[PDB]
């Protein structure tokens, strides 16, 4: 689909995310061409998942605390597709503020930006 | 122009920014569907322009200090376009780190995302 861009309405989609640590779950994710990597909430993961420490650069500078990296790939299915996006690793928001489909995932579903 | 999305290559554009406090300058800016509003480096504004306190939420959480809000509109012209984007307000990076074209600007471009 074609998603218009509007400051007042964030471009979000429903996605089914399988972390391979518990059953696949539905999230609402922000479509973000400014994210190098996809971010999913830590709430998706079972209690004893090994997640790696990582740094992430965002608006207010570098954060060491907020994000971990998955050890296993994450599979993501978008509304009308059976074929999953498979990301070798993705960021995990330890604060559960963010679900963001970034350019890693958008690349796999051949998503583009179009400016007339 | 179609802009393919690739985690390894940030989607950037050259944009001429007119803060109306100084001579316009052309900068390289990130095309960012996950940005509510556009961000301009504080280095593009004259020393001692009035700038408003503001809070911004990003990957490291909320910052009170890092960004100001402009007092005057900011006009932005893209390659090969005469008509400016006119932003009532936008964010100002006091750390000179970021130039980000957000959905406020993208809406005026009539830019869209396309997921096949």
């Amino acid at each position: 689909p074609v998603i218009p861009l509007d400051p007042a309405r964030r471009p979000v989609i429903k996605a089914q995310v399988d972390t391979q640590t518990s059953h696949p779950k539905t999230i609402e994710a922000l479509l973000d061409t400014g994210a190098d990597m996809t971010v999913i909430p830590i709430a998706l993961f079972s209690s004893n998942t090994p997640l790696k420490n990582t740094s992430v650069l965002g608006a207010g500078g570098q954060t060491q605390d907020h994000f971990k990296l998955t050890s296993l790939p994450v599979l993501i299915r978008l509304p009308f597709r059976t074929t999953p996006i498979v990301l070798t690793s993705c960021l995990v928001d330890t604060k559960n503020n963010w679900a963001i489909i970034g350019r890693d995932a958008l690349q796999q579903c051949q998503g583009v930006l179009y400016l007339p | 122009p179609v802009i393919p999305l690739d985690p390894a290559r940030r989607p950037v554009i050259k944009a001429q920014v007119d803060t109306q406090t100084s001579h316009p300058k052309t900068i390289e800016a990130l095309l960012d569907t996950g940005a509510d509003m556009t961000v301009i480096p504080i280095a593009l504004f004259s020393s001692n322009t009035p700038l408003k306190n503001t809070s911004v939420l990003g990957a490291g959480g909320q910052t009170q200090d890092h960004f100001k809000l402009t007092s005057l509109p900011v006009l932005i012209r893209l390659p090969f376009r005469t008509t400016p984007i006119v932003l009532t307000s936008c964010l100002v990076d006091t750390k000179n780190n970021w130039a980000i074209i957000g959905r406020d600007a993208l809406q005026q471009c009539q830019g869209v995302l396309y997921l096949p």
């Binding site: 650069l57 960021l91 970034g102 | 960012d32």
Partner: peptide, 8 residues
């Protein structure tokens, strides 16, 4: 680091 981008 990966970059991830801005909300008000």
């Amino acid at each position: 680091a990966p970059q991830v981008x801005v909300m008000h």
